[PDB]
Structure formats: C-alpha cells, structure tokens
C-alpha cells in the first residue's frame, strides 16, 4: 500500500479536464494508456536538446541520441529481465512484433503437417499472422478450447499441442476476459512437444512484472502505448539462439553489414531486425515510461489493479441485468453487457457523463462468437484509476438502465 494515487494522478495532465461538463473518468486504458509528465518531458527534452540520427558517434548530438536509444534498449532488457540487449528489438508495436515472428520464424519453419496452436481468446494481432503463415506454408492452425469461465486448462493444452506442433501462440493476459493465462506451464508443455512459444504480452506488460527467464517464453511482444509510453513503438523479445537463425523481416540501411550489387550481409543482433532510421524519440520515451513504472513498482500497480478489479466485480454484481464475462481472478478490466441495451448506446450515455469506456468487439471476433454476443462494453483500469471512478461507472450504468427502461414503455404508452 505504498502507492499514493493522488500523487500519481497529479503527474498525468490529461486526467484533469472535463468532458460534456463532467470530470473526465478515463476507463479505457486497455485500448491505450495515458502518459505522465516524465514521458512527455522526455520527448520534449529529446526534441529540444539532442535530436540526431543514431549509431555513428560522429558528432556530439548524434552521440547523445545514440546513447539515449541504446540506454532505452538496456532499460527494456532489465525491465523484462532479458539476458541480452541482442534479444530486445524495437518495433512499431505488439502487432508488428508478432508479424515479424510469423514472417521470419513461422514461414521458415513450417511444412505440411506442422501445427500452430492458438486460443479462442486471442486478439486479432495474435490470429491473422498465424493464419497467413500456415496458409503460405500449408501447415495447420489449431485452437485451444476455453473453460466456461473464460480460462484455459493445462490438460486442454496438452491435448491440443502435439508432437507436430511447432509454434504455440498465446496471450499473457486477455484484453477482454481479463484472464491471466498460465504462460510458464504452457511454455513447458510446448517445449516438451518440440514447439516454441510466442507470448502476446501487450496487456500484461503494463500491469504486472514480466520475468522472461522465469516464463521461459521463446518470443514476447509488447506495446509502449499501453504502458504509459509513446505511441508507435513496441518491443519484440526473442531468445538469442532463435533470433540468430531468423532472417530479417525488413531490409535497408542500419541493418546491413556489407552491401553488394546483388547480395548483402546483415548486422549482428539486435540491429539485424531494425531497418532504416529507428523510432528514436519513441524508444527513449518508452525507457522513461519504464523508469516511471519501476519507480512506482509493478507489484504495487498489480496489487492496486487487483483491488480495483475485485471492487468493480462486487459493485457490478450489485447491478441487476448486467452480465460480466470472464473469471473471478482477473486483471484490471471488466467486459460486460447491459440487458436489452446495446453496448454502443451504453458507451455513448457514459461519455455523456464524462466516462470513457470501450464498446465493440475488442479485436477478438472469434471470442465474441464463443461468448455468443455481437458486441460488448469494457471498462479497463490502470495506476491512475480509483474506486470513486468505479462508483461513478456503476451509478452511470444504473442510471442508463433506468433511462432505457423509461424510454422503452413510455412510447409503449404510445
């Protein structure tokens, strides 16, 4: 309980505004997170003081920019407890990292009869690349079933993963159900069958500590915009032995060693996978966001989100005619639906009260079909959210219920 939430909110300028005459209640951090002054001012200092191209050491500003970029790389490495900076690749985001794994590893290690195994709860970023890969290779795509509470059983994993499985791609935390998947056990299961494991950690990395050596994941993808960092930057971690054998996904400057007229050689890791001028300011700002989160403490943030999630689940259960999807033990988010009220109208009415939630399919259409719903609403939490905001949310949901019941038969009166 070391965390002071008021002192934390004081660092986020975007929280201190009104929307439609009501104080802003931002409950959409699973879509994207807000940034503290540390990150924004890091970007400001970069553009104001030492912006330059990196990886030359020719003049002073170039050296400072290179130092910032590679220091951010080292910050990421220690943040996820990677063994080496050669295993940390800066990308455009989680989606780009997963696509890089699918292109450079899957399309080069899959033959007919091979299996890529995913789950029904995966976001589209962890579905479409594997579809395209197994189509290009003639392999087979399989799905791990889910329990009725939206979790995955280890025996179902042992059943789905076979000796023909080469890749197991799975989410660390589901942005819809809030489920925390048994990533370590699934990694051991995949390794027992001769498969590698790809972990979509876009929703886990911002909210809980990531120990890549303890999870024993082979690949791990994360996005900066979800963890108080700048947009347009993410990280691909891969085991160094795997990344050494993968060919680059992109080609150009900065990633080459020798360039002939028709053939070229690549740089060593990690620069082999970073073509062109890198995302310098964004990566430095992601390093700043890592410093911010680590100064607060990821275990603290996770405990705060557990408090928020338990409180929100209890208060949602106090509402009649509201369905919540997912297990009891969950990350800091609640996906739900109002009886006889479309989630889009729920979100509209909530925004009229200054409350920002999500309505739609959440980039998980097969999961929506598994849930037997067309769309849902979702309120997601982060380190700057409070129980009073959850009270505002549940009161607004009760008032939305009452208003849509009033409008209902007031023109049945007609």
Ligand X SMILES: Cc1ncc(COP(=O)(O)O)c(CN[C@@H]2CONC2=O)c1O
Catalytic site positions: 363
Q: Count CB neighbours of 324 within 10 A.
A: 18
Burial of 116 (0-12, 13-18, 19+ CB in 10 A): buried
Task: Select the residue interacting with ligand X from 207, 362, 392, 401 (CB under 6 A).
Answer: 362
Distances (CA, A) of 99 to 4, 182, 233, 249, 273: 39, 23, 14, 9, 12
286 is a contact residue toward its own copies (CB under 8 A): no
In the complex with ligand X, the residue whose CB is nearer, 129 or 401, is: 129
Place of tokens 């009161």: 395
Query: If contact means CB under 5 to 8 A according to the sort of partner, which of its own copies, ligand X, none does residue 203 touch?
Result: ligand X
94 is a contact residue toward its own copies (CB under 8 A): yes
Task: Select the residue interacting with its own copies from 66, 89, 93, 139 (CB under 8 A).
Answer: 93
> Do the bridges between strand 25-26 and strand 355-356 make them parallel or antiparallel, or are there none, so unpaired?
parallel
Among 384, 362, 383, which residue's Cα sits nearest to residue 374?
362
Q: Quick check: helix, strand or coil at residue 91?
A: strand
Q: Quick check: helix, strand or coil at residue 60?
A: helix
Q: Point out which span in 78-86, 119-127, 161-169, 206-214 binds its own copies (CB under 8 A).
A: 119-127
In the complex with ligand X, the residue whose CB is nearer, 137 or 249, is: 249
Task: Select the residue interacting with its own copies from 23, 70, 156, 250 (CB under 8 A).
Answer: 250
In the complex with ligand X, the residue whose CB is nearer, 140 or 143, is: 143
Q: Point out which span in 15-23, 211-219, 237-245, 387-395 binds its own copies (CB under 8 A).
A: 15-23
Task: Select the residue interacting with its own copies from 5, 38, 40, 373 (CB under 8 A).
Answer: 40
77 is a contact residue toward its own copies (CB under 8 A): no
Among 178, 182, 210, which residue's Cα sits nearest to residue 197?
182
Query: Whole-number minimum distance, CB 6 to ligand X, in Å?
Result: 27
Interaction pattern, residues 292-331, with ligand X; x per rule: CB under 6 A: ----------------------------------------
Task: Select the residue interacting with ligand X from 34, 175, 385, 400 (CB under 6 A).
Answer: 175
Task: Select the residue interacting with its own copies from 321, 363, 373, 395 (CB under 8 A).
Answer: 363
Query: Within 56-115, which residues bind ligand X (CB under 6 A)?
Result: 93-95
CB 7 within 8 A of CB 339: no
Query: Within 199-228, which residues bind its own copies (CB under 8 A)?
Result: 223, 225
Q: What is the DSSP string of 277-341?
A: S--HHHHHHHHHHHHHHHHH-HHHHHHHHHHHHHHHHHHHHTSTTEEEES-SS--SEEEEEETTB
Strands laid side by side in the 234-238 sheet: 88-91, 234-238, 219-223, 196-200, 165-171, 115-119, 140-144
The first and second tokens of residue 198, run together, are 């790809």
Residue nearest to ligand X (CB): 276
In the complex with its own copies, the residue whose CB is nearer, 194 or 276, is: 276
13 is a contact residue toward ligand X (CB under 6 A): no
**CA–CA separation, 98 vs 110, rounded Å?**
16
Among 309, 93, 118, 345, which residue's Cα sits nearest to residue 221?
93
In the complex with its own copies, the residue whose CB is nearer, 84 or 277, is: 277
* Residues making contact with ligand X (CB under 6 A): 30-31, 53, 93-95, 123, 125, 171, 175, 200, 202-203, 223, 225, 234, 253, 276-277, 362-363
């Amino acid at each position: 309980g070391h965390m002071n939430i008021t002192d934390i909110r004081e660092q986020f300028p975007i929280l201190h505004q009104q929307v439609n005459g009501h104080d802003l209640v931002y409950l959409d951090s699973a879509a994207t997170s807000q940034k503290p002054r540390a990150v924004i001012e890091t970007l400001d200092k970069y553009y104001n003081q030492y912006n330059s191209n990196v990886h030359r050491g020719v003049h002073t500003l170039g050296t400072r920019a290179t130092d910032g970029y590679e220091g951010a790389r080292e910050k990421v490495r220690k943040f996820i407890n990677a063994k080496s900076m050669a295993e940390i690749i800066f990308t455009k985001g989680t989606t780009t990292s997963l696509n890089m794994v699918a292109l450079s590893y899957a399309r080069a290690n899959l033959k007919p009869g091979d299996e890529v195994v995913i789950t029904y709860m995966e976001a589209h970023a962890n579905i479409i690349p594997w579809q395209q890969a197994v189509k290009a290779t003639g392999a087979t795509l399989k799905y791990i079933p889910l329990q009725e509470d939206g979790t995955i059983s280890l025996e179902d994993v042992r059943e789905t993963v076979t000796s023909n499985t080469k890749i197991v791609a799975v989410s660390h935390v589901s942005n819809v159900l809030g489920t925390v998947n048994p990533i370590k056990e699934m990694a051991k299961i995949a390794h027992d069958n001769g498969a590698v494991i790809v972990v979509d950690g876009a929703q886990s990395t911002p909210h809980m500590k990531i120990d890549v050596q303890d999870l024993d994941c082979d690949f791990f993808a994360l996005s900066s915009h979800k963890m108080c960092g700048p947009t347009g930057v993410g990280v691909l971690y891969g085991k160094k032995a795997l990344l050494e054998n993968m060919e680059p996904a992109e080609f150009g400057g900065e990633m080459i060693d020798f360039v002939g007229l028709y053939e070229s050689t690549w740089k060593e890791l990690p620069w082999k996978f970073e073509a062109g001028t890198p995302i310098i300011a964004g990566a430095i700002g992601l390093g700043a966001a890592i410093d911010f989160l680590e100064e607060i403490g990821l275990d603290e943030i996770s405990r705060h989100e557990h408090k928020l999630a338990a409180y929100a689940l209890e208060r949602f259960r106090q509402l009649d005619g509201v369905t919540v999807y997912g297990p009891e033990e969950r990350a800091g988010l609640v996906t739900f639906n109002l009886d006889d009220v479309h989630p889009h109208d729920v979100a509209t009415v909530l925004d009229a009260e200054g409350i920002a939630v999500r309505a739609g399919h959440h980039c998980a259409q097969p999961l929506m079909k598994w849930l037997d719903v067309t769309a849902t609403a979702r309120a997601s939490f982060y380190l700057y959210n409070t129980e009073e905001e959850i009270d505002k949310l549940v009161e607004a949901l009760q008032k939305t219920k009452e208003y849509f019941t009033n409008v209902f038969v007031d023109l049945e009166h007609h």
